[PDB]
Amino acid sequence: NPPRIKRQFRDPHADWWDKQERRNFGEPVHEDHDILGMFSPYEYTWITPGKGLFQIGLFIASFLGLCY
Amino acid sequence: GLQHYKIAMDPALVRLGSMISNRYKYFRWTKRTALVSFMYVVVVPSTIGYLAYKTDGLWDLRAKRRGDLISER
Amino acid sequence: PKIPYPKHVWSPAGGWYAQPANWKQNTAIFGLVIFGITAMVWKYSAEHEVRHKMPEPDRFYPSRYWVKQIKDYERAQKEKQ
Amino acid sequence: LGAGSVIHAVADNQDFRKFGGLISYLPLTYSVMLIASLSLVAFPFMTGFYSKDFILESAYGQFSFSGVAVYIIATIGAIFTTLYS
Amino acid sequence: HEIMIDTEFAVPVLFKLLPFIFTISFSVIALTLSELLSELVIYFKFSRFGYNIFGFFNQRFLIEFFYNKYITNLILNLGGQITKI
Amino acid sequence: GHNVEEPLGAAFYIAVGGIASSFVIYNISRPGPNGEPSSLHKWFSKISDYKDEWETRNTLMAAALEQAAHDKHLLLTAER
Amino acid sequence: QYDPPTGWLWGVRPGEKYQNEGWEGPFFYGFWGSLIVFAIAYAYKPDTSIQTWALEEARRRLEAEGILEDPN
Amino acid sequence: MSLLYVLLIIPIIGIFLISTIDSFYFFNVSYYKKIALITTILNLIVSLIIYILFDFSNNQFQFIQENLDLSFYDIYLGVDGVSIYFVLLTTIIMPIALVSNWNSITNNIKSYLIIMLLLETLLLAVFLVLDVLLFYIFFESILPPLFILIGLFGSSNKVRASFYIFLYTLLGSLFLLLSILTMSSIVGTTYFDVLLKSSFEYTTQLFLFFGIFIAFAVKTPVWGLNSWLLRAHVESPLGGSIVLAAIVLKLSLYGVFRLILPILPQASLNLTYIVYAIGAITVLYASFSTLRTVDVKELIAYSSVAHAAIYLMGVFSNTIQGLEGAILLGLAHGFVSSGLFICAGGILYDRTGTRLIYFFRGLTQIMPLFSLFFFILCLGNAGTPLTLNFVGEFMSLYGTLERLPIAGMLASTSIIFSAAYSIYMYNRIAFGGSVSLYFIDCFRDLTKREFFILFTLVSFTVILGIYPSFVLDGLHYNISSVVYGIEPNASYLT
Amino acid sequence: MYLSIIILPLLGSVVSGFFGRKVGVSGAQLITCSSVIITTILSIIAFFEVGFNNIPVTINIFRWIDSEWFIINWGFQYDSLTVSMLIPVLIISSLVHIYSISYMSSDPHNQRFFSYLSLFTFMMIILVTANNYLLMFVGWEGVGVCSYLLVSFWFTRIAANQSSISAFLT
Amino acid sequence: PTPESEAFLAKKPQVPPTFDGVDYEDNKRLKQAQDAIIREQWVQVMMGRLVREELSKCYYREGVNHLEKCGKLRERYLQLLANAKVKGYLFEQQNYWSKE
Amino acid sequence: YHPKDAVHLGLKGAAVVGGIGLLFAAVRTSLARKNVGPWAIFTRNGKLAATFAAVGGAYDFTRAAAANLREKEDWVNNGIGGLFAGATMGLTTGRIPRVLGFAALTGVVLATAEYAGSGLRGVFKRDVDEYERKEFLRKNRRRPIEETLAEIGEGRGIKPPGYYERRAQRLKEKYGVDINPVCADPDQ
Numbered sequence A: 001n002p003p004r005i006k007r008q009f010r011d012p013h014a015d016w017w018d019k020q021e022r023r024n025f026g027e028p029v030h031e032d033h034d035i036l037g038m039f040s041p042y043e044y045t046w047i048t049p050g051k052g053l054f055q056i057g058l059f060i061a062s063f064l065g066l067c068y
Numbered sequence B: 001g002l003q004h005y006k007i008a009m010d011p012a013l014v015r016l017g018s019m020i021s022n023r024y025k026y027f028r029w030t031k032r033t034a035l036v037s038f039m040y041v042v043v044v045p046s047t048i049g050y051l052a053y054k055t056d057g058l059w060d061l062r063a064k065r066r067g068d069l070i071s072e073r
Numbered sequence C: 001p002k003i004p005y006p007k008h009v010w011s012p013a014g015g016w017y018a019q020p021a022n023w024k025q026n027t028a029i030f031g032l033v034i035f036g037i038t039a040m041v042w043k044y045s046a047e048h049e050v051r052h053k054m055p056e057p058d059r060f061y062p063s064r065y066w067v068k069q070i071k072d073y074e075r076a077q078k079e080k081q
Numbered sequence D: 001l002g003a004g005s006v007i008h009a010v011a012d013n014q015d016f017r018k019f020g021g022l023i024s025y026l027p028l029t030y031s032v033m034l035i036a037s038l039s040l041v042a043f044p045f046m047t048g049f050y051s052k053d054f055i056l057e058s059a060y061g062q063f064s065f066s067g068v069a070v071y072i073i074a075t076i077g078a079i080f081t082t083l084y085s
Numbered sequence E: 001h002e003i004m005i006d007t008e009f010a011v012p013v014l015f016k017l018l019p020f021i022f023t024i025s026f027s028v029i030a031l032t033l034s035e036l037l038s039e040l041v042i043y044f045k046f047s048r049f050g051y052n053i054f055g056f057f058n059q060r061f062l063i064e065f066f067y068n069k070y071i072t073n074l075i076l077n078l079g080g081q082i083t084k085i
Numbered sequence F: 001g002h003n004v005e006e007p008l009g010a011a012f013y014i015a016v017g018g019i020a021s022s023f024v025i026y027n028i029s030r031p032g033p034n035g036e037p038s039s040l041h042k043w044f045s046k047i048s049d050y051k052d053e054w055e056t057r058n059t060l061m062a063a064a065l066e067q068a069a070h071d072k073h074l075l076l077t078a079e080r
Numbered sequence G: 001q002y003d004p005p006t007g008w009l010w011g012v013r014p015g016e017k018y019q020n021e022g023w024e025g026p027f028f029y030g031f032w033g034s035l036i037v038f039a040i041a042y043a044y045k046p047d048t049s050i051q052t053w054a055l056e057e058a059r060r061r062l063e064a065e066g067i068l069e070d071p072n
Numbered sequence H: 001m002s003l004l005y006v007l008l009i010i011p012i013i014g015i016f017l018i019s020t021i022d023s024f025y026f027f028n029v030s031y032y033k034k035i036a037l038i039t040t041i042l043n044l045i046v047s048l049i050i051y052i053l054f055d056f057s058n059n060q061f062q063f064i065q066e067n068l069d070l071s072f073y074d075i076y077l078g079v080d081g082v083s084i085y086f087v088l089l090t091t092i093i094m095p096i097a098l099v100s101n102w103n104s105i106t107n108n109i110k111s112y113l114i115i116m117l118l119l120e121t122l123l124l125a126v127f128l129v130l131d132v133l134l135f136y137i138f139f140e141s142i143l144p145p146l147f148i149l150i151g152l153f154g155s156s157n158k159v160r161a162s163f164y165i166f167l168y169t170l171l172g173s174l175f176l177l178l179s180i181l182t183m184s185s186i187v188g189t190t191y192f193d194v195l196l197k198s199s200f201e202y203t204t205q206l207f208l209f210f211g212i213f214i215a216f217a218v219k220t221p222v223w224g225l226n227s228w229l230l231r232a233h234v235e236s237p238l239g240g241s242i243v244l245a246a247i248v249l250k251l252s253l254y255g256v257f258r259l260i261l262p263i264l265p266q267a268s269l270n271l272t273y274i275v276y277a278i279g280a281i282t283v284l285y286a287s288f289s290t291l292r293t294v295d296v297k298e299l300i301a302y303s304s305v306a307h308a309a310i311y312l313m314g315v316f317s318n319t320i321q322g323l324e325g326a327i328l329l330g331l332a333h334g335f336v337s338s339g340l341f342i343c344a345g346g347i348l349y350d351r352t353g354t355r356l357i358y359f360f361r362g363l364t365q366i367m368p369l370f371s372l373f374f375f376i377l378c379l380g381n382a383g384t385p386l387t388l389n390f391v392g393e394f395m396s397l398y399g400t401l402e403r404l405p406i407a408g409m410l411a412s413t414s415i416i417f418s419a420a421y422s423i424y425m426y427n428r429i430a431f432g433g434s435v436s437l438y439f440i441d442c443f444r445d446l447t448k449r450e451f452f453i454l455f456t457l458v459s460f461t462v463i464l465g466i467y468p469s470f471v472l473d474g475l476h477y478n479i480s481s482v483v484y485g486i487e488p489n490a491s492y493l494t
Numbered sequence I: 001m002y003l004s005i006i007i008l009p010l011l012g013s014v015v016s017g018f019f020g021r022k023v024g025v026s027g028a029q030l031i032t033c034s035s036v037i038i039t040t041i042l043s044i045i046a047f048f049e050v051g052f053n054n055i056p057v058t059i060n061i062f063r064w065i066d067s068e069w070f071i072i073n074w075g076f077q078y079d080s081l082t083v084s085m086l087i088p089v090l091i092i093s094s095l096v097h098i099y100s101i102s103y104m105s106s107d108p109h110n111q112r113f114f115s116y117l118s119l120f121t122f123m124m125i126i127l128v129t130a131n132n133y134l135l136m137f138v139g140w141e142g143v144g145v146c147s148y149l150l151v152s153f154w155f156t157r158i159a160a161n162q163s164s165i166s167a168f169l170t
Numbered sequence J: 001p002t003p004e005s006e007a008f009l010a011k012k013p014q015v016p017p018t019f020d021g022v023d024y025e026d027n028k029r030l031k032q033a034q035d036a037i038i039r040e041q042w043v044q045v046m047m048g049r050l051v052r053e054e055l056s057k058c059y060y061r062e063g064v065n066h067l068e069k070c071g072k073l074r075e076r077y078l079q080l081l082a083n084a085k086v087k088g089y090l091f092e093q094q095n096y097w098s099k100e
Numbered sequence K: 001y002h003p004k005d006a007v008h009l010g011l012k013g014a015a016v017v018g019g020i021g022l023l024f025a026a027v028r029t030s031l032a033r034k035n036v037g038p039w040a041i042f043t044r045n046g047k048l049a050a051t052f053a054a055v056g057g058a059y060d061f062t063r064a065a066a067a068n069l070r071e072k073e074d075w076v077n078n079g080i081g082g083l084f085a086g087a088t089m090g091l092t093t094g095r096i097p098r099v100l101g102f103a104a105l106t107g108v109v110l111a112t113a114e115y116a117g118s119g120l121r122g123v124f125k126r127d128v129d130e131y132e133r134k135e136f137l138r139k140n141r142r143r144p145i146e147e148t149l150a151e152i153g154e155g156r157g158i159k160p161p162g163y164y165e166r167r168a169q170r171l172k173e174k175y176g177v178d179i180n181p182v183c184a185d186p187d188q
């Protein structure tokens, strides 16, 4: 089994046999191929999930502070 | 049967499907599989059944007006 | 630049860039068949619309010209003294 | 529709970072789009002034805490609206 | 519940008019920052405090990130667990 | 330009002829101002009358199958 | 400038015509024709719905009360 | 002779003619196919004649023949407003089942046609017989010809698939046999009119329920138990898959209006919470795993499990609305599941020879007509208004909620998750990129055969979704005799 | 008239969608646009007629769902709130069609686009003119289908596919 | 009252909607009992349908003043909504209940 | 009831069941294909006899114990002794899944055998007229309303005459609120 890495992270400029999905013809596929493809839920890489809970926590506190 | 059109059958994808169709031959009883096999089959349906038992005929909204109560029991 | 497309593909909505030569004649024919269906639907409404209030005798209300319930009222109201 | 015209007028590009000038090239679009932004911000005597600002004053009009809170909250919403416009 | 009479008479002129002042104040401020003093915003973007506040809003309160990862991808793995295990 | 023309097609006529046929048949089969059904309507209700013919046949069968319900108990529950 | 309309309907190339396979005969005359004849006859079928019956009585019960107006 | 026996004898006459024409001629197989299709047209013609003469508010069985020559096992054929539409669905479906698979069989064509003509007889019988032991006889005679319909005309995993349906359906049906045998011994017969009179003691009804439900949970099928369907409804030929899903799946839906609702009411009432828990789980677990299915035909089969749960919860609501919505959703699934097996197992598998969804993409670009019908079928499977499927779900869910409000709320998740699997499959095959690169050459769009069976099936779904009273008027009076209950000022009148 | 407002946007869509071959790109554009234009005048008239005279309009055509206690009609009611909603709906639909005669001028598929536009207008009319909550739900779902069909109009863009699934399931 | 239609004779129950004093082994009488209970319950629910249709017209006739002018129709409709449901006969067939 | 000495009875099963398994090991040695000797019955096939002894002793003891604990005699105890028997069955094979699987398979049989009645000996005879018993249950078509209410209960759409007045009482006793629905009509 290959690593479970989404093809959203592959290069959008390589010599892919299938440019739309970023795949070469006989390449091995992870068993989770259905949901690793270009038409699958997106991976957001702006911040780590732990830090986001903090920042959305800060917005909530300020909103409560304005309410108070 | 009928001859189909030419398909670039992918050696990779064919064996992926051949993996899935034959997958069950390799399932084993481990500590991990029992945990999932116990939660989905027993806990979650038992939990649903308990709520279904305790709320049976508990509430009726039919014709109920103000001054009357939704609870039937 | 117009996209290259396969010419063997048949599509009810034309496909790519499809305009026939006779399109004005086809368009005209479709206009009448629409206008005929709408006319049947209008005669239906005229005879099945239901109002509990009746329009004033003097204010603009072009429905008074085609709806039976209203027209029967004003015809009856046009009988007094 | 106004912002639809500016996207078409260039390359079907959509990014603000690569648009500039274009006030002389698109005289009608800017005015009409500024017709819209003046009412979007509810500039006095626009179509938005008679609706958007009545909710703000009717919010404070309902003399309750929740009414006052949403006045303050929606007022901040107004100021950031004027900002991105 | 009605508030029309109060909103017509009770509200003071300050809160009745306040959105106009804010719009006329921050508009000239925004034009000045966007054109006259085109350096303050970059200090903000390239401050670390502003680098984070900027990316919190550009990323839409991180809502999509959380839904897609915690809600949507949970359902796909639940479906996988039921199918495989 | 070109001169490849398009016939309106059979689908156009079946759809229009379908719409015409429904309105024509529906208007024909209406009962009327007050009662007075059509000759076809009088024919239809006549053929499928069965005023008591199902009730008379089902009553006999229920009686006999009740009777053999009793008779099978009697024969299968006899003293050894 | 618009291109000419095109396409092989049923995959029939512009030279030849659709060859009848066999099904077309009974499916178009028997299968569909049975449904049109069913639809035409369904109009004259009498209505034995429980509602048409229950409405006529239930109107007469309400007519005794002031709830519905009686013509007589 | 009765007119309900004419429905049975015509397919029997058709089997005789297919086997005795080659004796009047090396005759062509085309003439084998025409005879079988004409003879399923006649059954449809007769069945509509029966429907014109039906009486929509009669509480006696209709089209009965007085036998008065009693034996041990006698066929009694009656039609009722709760069974009429199941018969009509059978007779409309079986011609499309033949036309759908017209060029795809290619070998053993006589045997194929003789099995389907045999199947139509047995499935017509199961709705027409007036005994519960007679019901069981035909409910299980369909089992041998289906073992052979899959092993002769099935796909690669056909052998295991044919063993699964036969053995699961045999096992589950033998717990129903024990309960039928108990009812007959207590009452003396299994003729409907004598059973519905009789009221069993609570404990006996609690043990007849355990036995009729084991069977129907095996034959719904519920989630824990559906491993035969994911094999049989996929490895089978296209015509086999249409009958199995549209008609065979409903044998237990119509078998609850006969075997449970009128003769075991106290058990049905006190055990409903167990049914609803099972039904809620199969609405979720089946919906979750219909997302992750890489076989297109298997994805359609898994959809049927989630649909069947909604109608099973409707038939256990003790409400007039969930009972009629259950029949409507049974009919609705019949037309729509038929079309999606026609799309999956009969068009893509005809052109690609594969069912893996990895090879498909952007089929709208070269088959616009397939895309149009595939999307309408996919939206009915998603329970979208203007289709008969939406009405069946709305009324099924309402009764589930009025009876036990918590399970209906978990059943209503279907609204969200049926839409998620249906759109995701449609978007992956028709949309979702460009024409896939695994397609070495181009693929023709729909043939005139493929267009007109999809068009026929889609038309039934819409017109019945606009005017469901075409089916509701027959159901109201007859359904009104399987409800159990009283209201305080309306009961025990003087 | 009132039941003609409902029907015209529907009819134009049928011609443009299943008959785009026959009328062509221009033929579809005229019928789709003009049919929606006509509906807009009919609804300007209905505003003065219903609102400015306080005369609600009822029509009932046939049953949809007829079970005991549950009778939902294929019926419509024009009241003060109804006619207010139609005026923005029909003008903005009427003008966006005219706008689109030039915006989509280079697109390969105009008969499909203008069909979806007419179809969308029909569904908002159904949504705001129903008698009951359940026929309201036909337009509520109908506009949902029409949105998915138009966020995904260029179905060859995977981004467009993702956003249409998101519109649909949310 | 409205004249009783000809179609309203072949389906008019001839029997009181009860099971008291009804021999069950007499199938015709038992089936007619069953039919007599089904039709009373159905007339009761169609009585609500008609009152609800009148209420609807009263609502659109009076508009703002619906809250005062349509209450008698409201009262009748809300009584039928709890008094009438189609519950079948199966319970009444299998149980005997008396006033005492 | 009369308490029973669990340890005594438990040994009896060990000797009864183990005694039979000792005869099975005797078959194994007699059919041995080599010159294994007489004492091989206790060395080569001893584990065969031990597992019978283990299973027999667990079952009768655990059942007799569970009989004492619940102070009742019924089909249930034949279950508890059954599960503890299959539990001991799987202890030999050393696999955890077989411990649960054997116990489930073992205990479900023994409960099913008992609850269904003793079939393998003489089935219990009620000694009553079968024609009367069968005919009563065929013609017992109606029941007293009170009888059905006990099993199902009033409610869930079973609203017997007087349900509202009783419901008034039930709600008043529990919630403590007087029921007084609104007239919903401004006149009378």
Ligand SMILES: CCCCCCCCCCCCO[C@@H]1O[C@H](CO)[C@@H](O[C@H]2O[C@H](CO)[C@@H](O)[C@H](O)[C@H]2O)[C@H](O)[C@H]1O
Pocket (backbone or CB within 6 Å): B059, B061, B069, B070, B071, H405, K175
């Ligand atoms: C769509 C399906 C809808 C039906 C299913 C859900 C129905 C839910 C009905 C809830 C209300 C039923 O009736 C309601 O009982 C709850 C019981 O806690 C009471 O709730 C109250 O209980 C206590 C008193 O005991 C109060 O102090 C407390 O403030 C509040 O929780 C309400 O006073 C009563 O009105």
Ligand SMILES: CCCCCCCCCCCCO[C@@H]1O[C@H](CO)[C@@H](O[C@H]2O[C@H](CO)[C@@H](O)[C@H](O)[C@H]2O)[C@H](O)[C@H]1O
Pocket (backbone or CB within 6 Å): H019, H108, H109, H110, H111, H112, H114, H115, H144, H145, H148
């Ligand atoms: C309870 C039993 C099970 C129930 C299901 C019954 C299924 C019955 C299947 C149909 C009967 C057998 O069907 C029979 O198939 C054989 C296959 O060799 C056919 O026999 C023929 O097949 C092909 C057909 O082209 C010929 O080339 C070949 O020369 C000849 O043997 C018979 O013409 C057909 O009648």
